């Protein structure tokens, strides 16, 4: 961008930062939610053999 396109450069930056926060947040919760379920899954499976 040129020095007379500061609002356009800022629009570009914001768009890119916005998507980065969305993907980072989703990556963090997908991993935590999936790990909660993986461990419950394994506990369920050993109990299922028991019954």
């Amino acid at each position: 961008f040129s020095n007379l396109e500061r609002r356009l450069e800022n629009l570009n930056k914001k768009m890119e930062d916005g998507f980065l926060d969305v993907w980072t947040y989703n990556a963090e919760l997908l991993v935590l939610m999936e790990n909660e379920r993986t461990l419950d899954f394994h506990d369920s499976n050993v109990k299922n053999l028991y019954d």
């Binding site: 007379l4 396109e5 500061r6 609002r7 800022n10």
Partner: protein
């Protein structure tokens, strides 16, 4: 603009002023350097107390 007109790249200036906070007003071209010219012009559009 008390004297009707326009300001170029005004939105870019307003954007520039966002990341500024304080600034110092500095005299660059003192009015009295303009000898051989009239520096006392003006308009009723920007009048103060009629004048």
């Amino acid at each position: 603009l008390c004297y009707p007109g326009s300001f170029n790249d005004y939105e870019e200036l307003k954007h520039l002023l966002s990341s500024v906070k304080h600034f110092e007003k500095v005299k660059i071209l003192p009015k009295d350097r303009w000898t051989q010219h009239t520096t006392t012009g003006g308009s009723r559009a920007c009048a103060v107390s009629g004048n």
